[PDB]
C-alpha cells in the first residue's frame, strides 16, 4: 500500500469492551498487536485513530429503537473507557468517541481522514462482526481502500469472526495479518 | 403479535432486479423473495404508504463504481441488458419510489434518507437480496440513523443459507425486529 | 488561475426553464445560460465531467421541506417547462444529471459520490441563485474539501445587491472567484 | 405569538469563545450577544433541555483545517491562549454539551445531528457569531436536514451590520422563523 496515505483505526480497545472478545484472538493479543501497528504508524507519521464507544449515565446519546435482542442500560463500570496500558496510547493519537457500532456516524473520523489526505485504512479491534464491520462497510462505501488486520480483531466467537472474515471482508477489503501489514508500511 | 403503525411505515425492497436474482442461493429462492416482496408492496400501496424500489448498478464506463482493491473483486463485465428490470411480480406502479444506488448500502449517494424523513417515516420494513450484503449494509445504516427496522426474513435471500442465517441469528436481532411476511402483513 | 484540468468538473445549478425567471441581477438569465454553455462546451471538449443540477418536486410535493418559516414558497403547480434545459446549454447524453429537492446540491443526491469516484478535486460552480442554491452548494463543497472556483459572471440572484454581497464577502473565503473567460483560459 | 415546544427544542450557540468575540462588528456587540445568548441558555437549562456550546478551532499543526486555495485566506497563526475560552455570562456548566467544529458549519464532522435526533429535538434556536458565516452555514445545513429553525436575531452578530442584515432579511426568512431573544424567552 501507499504508506504516506494510510491511517490506522482501532475499534473500542477499552476495558469495558475487552470482556466481549470471546474468539478467536484474546483481548490481550488484539491490544498488543494494535499497539505494534500503532507504533509502526507513528514512526511514519501516519494517523492513529483510537475509537471508543459509550454513553453518559442517562444514555441520552444511545439508540433506543425496539429490537429483538436489546442490550441492557446498565451502569457502566468505572473502567469502561480506559485504554489498556499495552495499547501504548500517546497524546498524538486521535481519540474518536462513537455512540453506536460504526465509527463514522456522529464523529469526526471522515473529516480527519479526508483533511489528512488519507485514502487507505487499516482496521482492527473488537468486535469483528459488530462495530469493526459497521465501520468497514461505511469506509468502503466512502471510497477508502480497506485492510483488515485479521489477527488484531476478535468477536463474541470464532465462528462469528470467521464468517465475516471469509464472506464479507474479502469483498470490501484486503484481509491481512499484522505481520503482512507491518511489512507493507 | 406484531403491530405496525402503517402511517409512519415504509417498505424498502433491495435490489429485486433481474440482474441480481442469480446471486440468491438460499434459504429462500429469488422467485420466492420477489413474490413475497410483491405481496408486501401490494399491501403498502393499498394502505397509501411509500414503497421504495431500490436497484443497484453503474453506467457502461463503470464511473460510479467503487474500484478499491479487495481480495475477492467482482469483474467489470458488460451488464446484461435485463440488469435493471423489475420482475413483473413486484407489481411496479408509477407511485413506487425508485431509488438508484451505486454500492451495497442504499443510503450513500441516494435520496433514501431524504424521502423517509420528509414523508414522516420512522419505521422501515426491509427485504431483498442479499441478506448479508446490501440488505445488511442498508439495515446497519438505517439503525444508526435512528429508524426502526423490521426485517421480512422470508423475503430475503443470500448466497447461501448459512450466510443468511448468520445475519438473521447474530446481527439483525440487535438492530431490528425479525418477522415473517405473514406477521408483517397481519400487522399492517 | 491555476487549475488541474484533469481533476476539475463543472457544476451548473438549476439552469432550467422554470428557474430562469428568478435571475434578477446583476447578470441576466441569458448571460448565465450563454456563459454556462461556453463553460460546458470547454469541459466536454476536454473530456471532463459536466454536472447539470436541477431542482423540483413531484406534484404532491412529498420531497419538499415543510418546516415553518417566515417566508415560505407557495406549493403551486409547476409549469410544464419547469425542468427543461435551455438549448444553449448544449445538453448531451454524457452530461451527468443531478436532481435535488432543496437549495444545496449535495443533500439527498449523488453529487459527492460522483465527484469523488471520478477523481475530481476541483469544482467550477455557476447558476441561479448566487446566494441561495449556488451558495448552499458552495458552502457544502468547501466543507467537503473540494477546491472551488466561482464563475461570477455565470451566476445571478434575486437582486444585484444579494449577488454582490455573496461575491464580495462569502465566496472569497471559500473559493477563487473568476470570470468565465479567465476560467476558460485556465483549462 | 411564537409557538415552541420547549421540550423538543435545543439551543445551539455558535462560537461564543474569546478568540471569536473581536470579530463582532455589528449590529450587536460581542457583549450583547454573549449576555443575550446567556439568557437563552439559562432559559433552556431551566427547561431541562440541551444547550450545545459550539466552538471552532484547530490543533497547533492545523491538521483538521480546510486548506484549499481561496481568494481571501485566513492566516495560519498560533491561536491565542484565550481562543477557546467560554465567557462567564454564558453560564457554561457540566451538563452543557460541548461541540468542537473545524470549519464554518457545526454539523460536518460533529455529533450535533446525532445528539439532536437521539434527544428527540425537532427545533433549534440558533445564535452566535458570525451571522453570515458559521451561524449561516449551520442554519442552511439544519434546514436541509429537516430541523425547524428559529434565529435569535439580536443574539447574532457579523463582521458588519450589512452582512448580518443581508442574511436576516434575505436568507433566514426562507429557512427559519426570525425572532428576538425576548420573543423566544416568552415562547419557551
Swiss-Prot record, chains B, D:
The protein's Enzyme Commission number: 3.-.-.-
GO terms for MF: hydrolase activity
Disulfide bond annotation, renumbered to this chain: none
Highest rank taxon of the organism: Bacteria
Alphabetized UniProt keyword annotations: Hydrolase
Alphabetical list of InterPro entries matching this protein: Isochorismatase-like_dom, Isochorismatase-like_hydrls, Isochorismatase-like_sf
Pfam family name, one: Isochorismatase
Protein family per UniProt: Belongs to the isochorismatase family.
Designated name of the protein: Uncharacterized isochorismatase family protein YecD
Organism: Escherichia coli O157:H7
From Swiss-Prot, chain C:
EC number(s) recorded for this UniProt protein: 3.-.-.-
Signal peptide per UniProt: none
Keyword Mitochondrion: no
InterPro entries associated with the record: Isochorismatase-like_dom, Isochorismatase-like_hydrls, Isochorismatase-like_sf
Keyword annotations of the record: Hydrolase
Gene Ontology terms for molecular function: hydrolase activity
CDD domains: cysteine_hydrolases
Source taxon at top rank: Bacteria
Pfam families registered for this protein in UniProt: Isochorismatase
Keyword Hydrolase found: yes
Family stated for the protein in its record: Belongs to the isochorismatase family.
Name recorded for this polypeptide: Uncharacterized isochorismatase family protein YecD
Species of origin: Escherichia coli O157:H7
Gene this protein is translated from: yecD
